[PDB]
Structures are given as structure tokens and as C-alpha cells.
């Protein structure tokens, strides 16, 4: 079946909606909820978060669902089983702290040839795929055959929204393209799936062919008084989770 | 099949016995044996104890069985796989120290949606279900469909008995309602089971409908010269178990 | 099928051979090879050694087999998964250091009720079964139905041989009955097997009925120039095994 | 089916090619690529590397494949699950750092009798088989029935090539026969396979019968401007792998 995978680059705001497939699931990641409109609707099949902020993102996502801003069926942590990248205890105890979520690596590792591809480039050449590509690998492992890409701009404005929000900055004060492109080519060739681009003005469209025009319609709902920053758990909550950070 | 789940609140002494089901199993917990009469009989299907006193409670239970005060088929430890709540070595080595007992979490975790529900409230909001509710989740995991509740009073006298006994005080010198009520509602709705209340005068009866009057009979046997305090193992026994405390 | 289980008490020298069963396997333990005659033949189905001397006993057994003194099909370590009794790394790495041997606990633990029985008495009352009884439990787990006992004397001369040998003393300078008797009664009743005694003059014969007289014959071969002390591995070998001691 | 197993001794240069089997797979190890000609072709079924240099050898092998110098289907690490021989974290995390490779021990250990044979000699007598013999055991575990040996000379010039290369010396400045011979005899007798020698002038041919002359042909391709030293990863790569070295 068919999936739309969305990064959070500026092209998220410039999807050509006549090229949307007839039916589909949606994958989102990281600060997706910062978007000022529902560019791909409220309903997610899966959302993906990095280990470094998973504790805060899970808490924030439960707020989004309760407040009827989004829904999702799956919740994934984008990990790799690498000591230099992730806390060992966090991975070991994951299913006991977050019983309705999944370690993304449990799916990523089912693609042996791609896992090998990723590890060689990360360890020896310091070349790492982004979340956009990570989500593609997980979709392929779950059985999707046609993947439609949006919001992937290779960092050239940084984002489809203003990302410099108070709480996020408190947690992460920090707030090439070859790596992602070669990885997508490998996935397509190795696993016999099809990639499409939904964003004609994106740099991605230079490398990946456009989804065909099907005269599809889509209503873009605007958002108001919405959650536009990550939420920060209590000091007692951090105390309980402190081995895993 | 049918189960009666008993906490140790004052309502344990005020069961309406005409509402007992036609056939049933009984679950008890913690200091249940402090009761001055056999309010639910001598025969237990399962008994539940917290990790913090399991070593002493297991020793005490073997005395109760040998002395013909109670019998039980199952022995459960009420754990959650949470580092802030339980000793890691205790859980790791449990089946080798207590081969005829079970970790309650081995059953609790089979209810994925409830495990997620519990963990979110405990970790982020410092809201924890009590043993009464824990036993309900385990019963549901074991296949019970009709659950009859007693001895659940939400701590307002503290107990159906005087709990301030010498040994217990030596081990634990320490000797809201929304959390338990919302959790029971979730269990009932999610797993399609039925909850009943056996205690008409209890606060519980404001939230959970009464078991129907079936004109049942029950003989309440009085107790004499009985074990009414926890027993304390030898210093040599503590020495052997010291990694797990 | 039928098994003869032998301890190393003085009664090993006073078997009534007319009571030997028509066909059988033999279990031996610890310093059995110190015997001055082949009281039960050269062929063992299994030999059992304690964790504390396993490293040296395994080395010694390979010498016995090469020198054509004994043979055995199985090699067992008599462990319990108890931190106060055995080195944790020794158990964890056992199958990689001794690939043709077994941890006895892998069989012992298949008898859940007896494992529980043993652990309760050891941990809380400092009452421990001996190797003789351990071997019985393992035989029952392996499917034996009729067990014939010898060399079990409850330590009242200590042994059927002089145990005060140079190397053994170097490794272990140290070189009641109720516990073993109650444990054997439990095994017999719980698992529905039959116990017999082969040694009419033993204290054991006061508690366990004699094997029936079948007019069987047995040739007792004498031993000469034989291995009558444990062997000590090189200092380099100890260096390699030092985490496990 | 049929396999040629090659060590890197001087006899690698003196194969009698009329004795090559009609069809076959090839196993190579360690510094095989230092060879000045393709003595057994470019195509390997498997290549084997020691834990001590695996990090650098894997990196080097990926270069060889990209540069079209060799190909291989399998990549094996020649380990034994022994603390004195290999880094514990290296083994624990192996499949996550090298997803397209295998721990050789996962196959070696399938030969229980040989694993026991190896461990006894290594631990107690400081007698260790070489990589040549290790590869034979792995071939047998994978189902091969006829094994053809080359490049096994028992270290008497050291090698079929000059091994004193700059990078290798930087990583390993260090750059009897009874053990290997008795181990090969054990493998042959125990697992019912056939061993042949391809090198008539080798010391091996004194102990193992020659492969029959089949009038086979083989073209020995010369090598030019080829990789003749191990490659050294960046300091950043070592930083990431530092727990495993
Ligand atoms: C991108 C980079 O290398 N940044 C360097 C910093 O490294 C980051 O350090 C963090 C410390 O908690 C985390 O370990 C980051 O690791 C993750 C993460 O964010 O959790 C691991 C994820 O698996 C990975 N996600 C994917 C899909 O690959 C993310 C991801 O790469 C992004 O967050 C990167 O923007 O990273 C880890 O990247 C740090 O060493 C500083 C030095 O102090 O240098 C930065 O250059
Ligand atoms: C209730 C509470 O938070 N009390 C606080 C103390 O926390 C207790 O500390 C104990 C130290 O050994 C245990 O870790 C207690 O944890 C358990 C337990 O009793 O073993 C874990 C059980 O899984 C849990 N049982 C259930 C069914 O949820 C029990 C249970 O919640 C009751 O025993 C609570 O009455 O707790 C742990 O609760 C401690 O931090 C002191 C500070 O020193 O503050 C108390 O407020
Ligand atoms: C018998 C006793 O309690 N002796 C006390 C000593 O305890 C011994 O300490 C040893 C130190 O390496 C071992 O841990 C002994 O544990 C075993 C063993 O010999 O390996 C564990 C075995 O599972 C057990 N075998 C069986 C079949 O039960 C043996 C066995 O009980 C006999 O070896 C006992 O004679 O023990 C452990 O028993 C030690 O604490 C000294 C104090 O320094 O006090 C002794 O009383
Ligand atoms: C051969 C020997 O005993 N050399 C002694 C040194 O021991 C070497 O130390 C290394 C330190 O990183 C490694 O642990 C070597 O272990 C392996 C290896 O090279 O990785 C383990 C492999 O499984 C083994 N391979 C096979 C197929 O058996 C190799 C192999 O034996 C060869 O590399 C040996 O030439 O060894 C380990 O052997 C070291 O203790 C020095 C003292 O400082 O003394 C040397 O005699
Ligand atoms: N300018 C951008 C911002 C994000 N992306 C993609 O969106 C994904 C989510 O953004 P982030 O920076 O939070 O990882 C990111 O991993 C890339 O796949 C991009 O391609 N170009
Ligand atoms: N006053 C009371 C005392 C106990 N209970 C219940 O009885 C259970 C056992 O009592 P305890 O305090 O030992 O956990 C407790 O977990 C609650 O479920 C109660 O509801 N009200
Ligand atoms: N005097 C003795 C000596 C040994 N035994 C038995 O022989 C077994 C082996 O002797 P040992 O002391 O090495 O554990 C021992 O465990 C007992 O089961 C005995 O019963 N009486
Ligand atoms: N002179 C030699 C060199 C190597 N070998 C064999 O070649 C194998 C690979 O060589 P190496 O030294 O890297 O382990 C080695 O393990 C032996 O099996 C040999 O037999 N004689």
C-alpha cells in the first residue's frame, strides 16, 4: 500500500495536492506539530522521535492527542543500537517505560543490506542519514511499496515553521545532501519499491520523479491556539527517568 | 469465570453476603491475614505482595499454610519493571529464589493499553494505582470476565484490622481516589469485562454498581490464636538475600 | 528405566550385590575415583561435581578417561543459581568453557515443586541437601522411575576411602540427616517414582526399603596404580579462568 | 559440496592446479589480499578475520570490493567466546556494528565435540588451532563434505608474500604443527568428511593425502597496482568504536 513521508523542511508548505495518491497513510517526525496548518491532515499512521528528546516528545504527544490536535496509530523512536548515539539503559528498558511505543530499530534492522549500508557510512565516514530517510526504511520494513516524499529539502528556511521556541531552546540550544540521495537510491534499487516527490519546487525533485497528476483534491485546515512548542515534564518525572538520560 | 478481589479497607467487614456469586475464586493481598475472621474463607486462588516486603511475606505465607490458616494456588509479586520502584537484582533472580511464585508484571504487561495507561500516570504525574486495581488487571490478563470488589475504600479506619503490629513496624515504621476510579473505568471499557461492588456502604458503591442479590449464603468462621503480624527471617537469611534488598 | 545413585560414604564398600537390578545406569560424584576398587564398575552414565572445584575436576576427569580408568556419557555441575553459593560469571560462561558438560540446574529447575522446596530450606533455615539427593532430583528430571541408592550414610568413616590427599588438601584444607531424608520422601511422593536401598547395614536402610533380592551377580574389579588425588592445572590455566573463580 | 580452504603460507604459491576439483567454493583469511597474483581467483565464498584487527579488516575489505579486487558472499570473525582472547563488548554488539557479517563462533559451536576439543587444549595446555583449522570447522558446520587444503605450512617464508607493510606494522609490530594435525584428524574422523591436500611439496602432504589428478585447468591472473597493506580508519571512527577495542 501507499504512504506519504514528511520531513519538516520548507517544502512541506508547497505540496502539489493534485498529485496526492488515491488513498494513503502518513508518517511525521520530530517538531511536525509546530506547523501552522494541517498540511497533511490530523491523522498519522506513525510519528517518529529521536532518543535525545523522546521523554519530552512522548509527553507532548499525549497532550496533542487529548487536545484533539492529532491522532496516531504508531509511535516510533529513531534509534540504531549505537553507543555513541544513544543511552544504553534507555534502549534496554524502553518497552517498560513506553509500552505502546516501538524502537524503530526493531524494524530498521529487518533490512539487513540497508543496516549494513548505514553503519558503514556512519562509523567510518561520519555520514548519517536524516530522519526523512530513516522513516523510508521503516516503511519498507513494514511492507509499503509506494512512497511519496515531502518536506525533504536537505537544509537548503531551516523549517516550514519558526523553530526557535522557548522550551525547545531550553532543551536544545542548537535550534551533505549526497548522503540522503545515495541512501534513497539504494533503498529503491535493493527492495524494489517506488519513490515519488510531491513537491515540484524542491531540490528533491531534481533527483526523484514527480508523483503523477491525478486531479486529487485536499482541504487544508488552518490551526488556531495550537501547541507550537515542546512541553517540559516536572522535576519529579525527570528524577524517575534519570538513569535513561 | 468469576473472581472476588479484596483490598484490606474497613469495608472488608461489611460485605453483603446475599450478593456473593454462585461460584468463585478469591484474590487477597499484603496484610490480609491480619483479619480477625475469615471474611472470604480460607481458600485463595492467588495472594499478592509488594517487592519491598516480599522476602518477609513469602516466609510468613509458608507459615500460614503449614499452620492450616490459609491455602493458595498462586503467589504473585506486584511489580512494574521500574527502577525507582524495585530492586533490579530482585527482579532478575526472582524465579530462582522463589520458584513456585510469579512476577505479577509477567501478566500485567499482557494488557498493553493498560500498561501504557499506568506508566504514563506514574512517571509523569506521580499518580499510582493501588494493589486492589493491580489485582484486577492481573485477573483480566488471566481470563476472568466478572470481577467482584470488596475492601476498597480509597483510604477514607485505615484497615479492617489494627495494622500497628510490632514486627511490621520494625520493617516499615510508616504504618487520590480519582486514580483508582479512572483506572477501573478504563479496564472495564477496554477489555469488556464486568465490575461489581459487594459492599453497599462503601464509597466504591457510588461509582460501581452492586452485585445482584442472589440469596446466597456464607458462613463466616471466626479465628483464634492466629498469625496477626508479619514474621522476620534470621540474620543469616538476610545475609543470603542482601543483594536483592 | 533404572539408575544406581552413589554417594561416597563408607557403605559404598558394603553393597549387597544380590539386590542389583537386572539392567541399570550409574551416577557418581565428587571424589568417587578415590575408591580402591570398582564398586560399581568403570562405566558411568553421569558424573557430578561442585562449582567450587569444577575447573580442577573436569581436568582430572579427562585424565581418567584417557587413562582408561572410567568412562562417562554426561558431565554435570551441581549448581542452584544462588549468588551466595556460586560465581556468577562461572555460570554465565559455563557452556563456552565446558561445551560437552551441563549445568545441573538446567535439569533441577524442571522439578518446580522440589526447586521451591530446596530454596525455602536453604535460604531461610540454612538446611541444604547433599550431592546424593541432588543427583536423585536430576535423575527424576531425566525420566528415571526406579532409583537404587548406595554410599549415603549421612556422615555417621567420613568416606569409603582416605580423602586426605596432598592436592585436595591444597585446594580445600577442610578435608542433619533429617534434611536428606525429608527431601527424598518429598521426591518419591511428589513425582511417583520408587526409591530402593542397596546397603542393608547403612542408616539409610532404616528409612528406605531394600531392593529385592534377585540373585544377581557382579564382579568387583580391583584397581592398581590408579589416580587417587585430584590434579592441579598450570598457573597459566588458572590465569585464563581467573574471572570464574 | 566442495570447498578450497586457504591459509597464507608459502605453499599458496605452489598449488598443483591439475588436482583442483571440478567445481568449488573458496575460503580466505587475514592478510590474503597481500598476494601478488590471484592464486585462487577473485571470488570468495567467505573471508575470515581475527577480533583483534576486525575493525580495520572490515574497512579494508569494503575498499577491496569497491575497487573490484575481490568479492565475497560471507564475512566471518574468528572468535571463541573466551574472555582472555576477545573484547566482551565487541562480541555483544557485533551484529549492530557489522550487520552483514557473522561471528564465526555461531557456526563453530554447532560442532559440540570439536568445541570441547578446542577449549580443553587452549585453556589447560595453551595449545591453540590456527585460522586454517578454524575455517575447516566452520565449513563442516555449514555442510561441506569435501575439503581441499592449501597455504598450510605450520610456520616452517613466513608467508606467500612480504607481510612487513607500514600500516600493518603500526597496528601489530609483531609481524606446534602437532596441534593443527591432531585437530584435522579429529574433524575428519568425527564428522565423516574428506580432507585433501592441493600442495604436493608442503609439509601438509606428509599427513594428508593428495587431491586426485583430474587434468583440471586454471588461469592465474597477475595483480597490478593493488591493495597490499591494511587500511587505517580515521581518528573519529576509532573514537566511535573505542568501547569495543
Ligand atoms: C548531528 C551531530 O552529529 N551532532 C553532534 C552532537 O551529537 C548529538 O548528540 C546528542 C547528545 O544527546 C545525541 O546523541 C544525538 O544523537 C541522535 C539524537 O538526536 O538522539 C541519535 C539519533 O538516532 C539521530 N537520528 C537519526 C534519525 O539519525 C539524531 C540525529 O542525527 C539528529 O539529532 C542530528 O541533528 O541524533 C547526536 O547526534 C554532539 O556530539 C555535538 C558535540 O557535543 O556535536 C554535534 O555536531
Ligand atoms: C507510596 C510512595 O510513593 N511512598 C514513598 C516511598 O516510596 C516507596 O519506597 C519503597 C522503598 O523500598 C518502595 O520502593 C515502594 O515501592 C513499592 C513497594 O512497596 O514495593 C513498589 C510496588 O510496586 C507498589 N505497589 C503497587 C501495587 O503499586 C508499592 C505501593 O505503591 C505501596 O507500597 C505504596 O504505599 O510501592 C515505594 O512506594 C519513599 O520514596 C518515601 C521517601 O523516602 O516517600 C514515600 O512517599
Ligand atoms: C557447607 C557450607 O555451608 N560450608 C561453608 C562454606 O561455604 C562453601 O563455600 C564455598 C566457597 O567457594 C562454596 O561456595 C560452597 O558452595 C558449594 C560448592 O562446594 O561449590 C555450592 C554447591 O552447589 C554445593 N553442592 C550441593 C550439592 O549442594 C556445595 C556443597 O553444599 C558442599 O560443598 C558443602 O560441603 O557447596 C559453600 O558450601 C564457607 O561459607 C565457610 C566460611 O568461610 O563456612 C562453611 O561452613
Ligand atoms: C598467539 C598468542 O598467544 N599471542 C600472545 C598475545 O595474545 C594475543 O593478544 C591479542 C591482544 O589483542 C589478541 O587477544 C589475540 O587473540 C586472537 C586475535 O588475534 O584476535 C583471538 C583469535 O580468536 C585467534 N584466532 C584464532 C583463529 O585462533 C588469534 C590467533 O590465535 C592469532 O592472532 C595468534 O597469532 O588471537 C591473542 O592471541 C599476547 O598475550 C602477548 C602478550 O602480551 O603474548 C603473545 O604470545
Ligand atoms: N531544511 C530541512 C529541514 C528538515 N529536513 C528533513 O526533515 C526531517 C525532520 O527535521 P529535523 O531537523 O528535526 O531532523 C529531517 O531529518 C530531514 O529529513 C530537510 O530535509 N530539510
Ligand atoms: N483504607 C483502605 C485500605 C486499603 N485499601 C485497598 O486495599 C489494598 C491493600 O492495602 P495496602 O495499604 O496494604 O496496599 C490497597 O492497595 C487498596 O487497594 C483501600 O482501598 N482503602
Ligand atoms: N559419610 C558420608 C559421606 C558422603 N555421603 C554422601 O556422598 C555424597 C558425596 O560426598 P561429598 O562429601 O564429597 O559431598 C555426599 O554429598 C552425601 O550424599 C554421605 O551420605 N555420608
Ligand atoms: N607459514 C605459515 C603461515 C600461515 N599458515 C596458515 O595460514 C593461516 C593464516 O595466517 P596467519 O598467520 O595470518 O594466521 C594461519 O592461521 C595458518 O593456518 C601456515 O600454516 N604456515
From TrEMBL, chains A, B, C, D:
Coiled coil: none
Annotated positions binding CMP: 8, 130-132, 153-155, 158-159
Record keywords: Glycosyltransferase, Transferase
InterPro entries, per the entry: A-2_3-sialyltransferase, A-2_3-sialylTrfase_sf
GO molecular function term, any single one: glycosyltransferase activity
Protein name: Alpha-2,3-/2,8-sialyltransferase
Gene: cst-II
Amino acid at each position: 500500500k501507499k504512504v506519504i513521508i514528511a520531513g519538516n523542511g520548507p517544502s512541506l508548505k508547497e505540496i502539489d495536492y493534485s498529485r496526492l495518491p488515491n488513498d494513503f497513510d502518513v508518517f511525521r517526525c520530530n517538531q511536525f506539530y509546530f506547523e501552522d496548518k494541517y498540511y497533511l491532515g490530523k491523522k498519522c499512521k506513525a510519528v517518529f522521535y529521536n532518543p535525545s528528546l523522546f521523554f519530552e516528545q512522548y509527553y507532548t504527544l499525549k497532550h496533542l492527542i487529548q487536545n484533539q490536535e492529532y491522532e496516531t496509530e504508531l509511535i516510533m523512536c529513531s534509534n540504531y543500537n549505537q553507543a555513541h548515539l544513544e543511552n544504553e539503559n534507555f534502549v534496554k528498558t524502553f518497552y517498560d517505560y513506553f509500552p505502546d511505543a516501538h524502537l524503530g530499530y526493531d524494524f530498521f534492522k529487518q533490512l539487513k543490506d540497508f543496516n549494513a549500508y548505514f553503519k558503514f557510512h556512519e562509523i567510518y565516514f561520519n555520514q548519517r542519514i536524516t530522519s526523512g530517510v530513516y522513516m523510508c526504511a521503516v516503511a519498507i520494513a513494514l511492507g509499503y511499496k509506494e512512497i511519496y516524499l515531502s518536506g525533504i529539502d536537505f537544509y537548503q528556511s531551516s523549517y516550514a515553521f519558526d523553530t526557535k521556541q522557548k522550551n525547545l531552546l531550553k532543551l536544545a540550544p542548537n535550534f551533505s545532501k549526497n548522503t540522503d540521495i545515495k541512501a534513497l537510491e539504494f533503498l529503491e534499487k535493493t527492495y524494489k519499491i517506488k519513490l515519488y516527490c510531491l513537491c515540484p519546487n524542491s531540490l528533491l525533485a531534481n533527483f526523484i520523479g514527480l508523483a503523477p497528476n491525478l486531479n486529487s483534491n485536499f482541504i487544508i485546515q488552518e490551526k488556531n491556539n495550537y501547541t507550537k512548542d515542546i512541553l517540559i515534564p516536572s522535576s519529579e518525572a525527570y528524577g524517575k527517568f534519570s538513569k535513561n538520560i
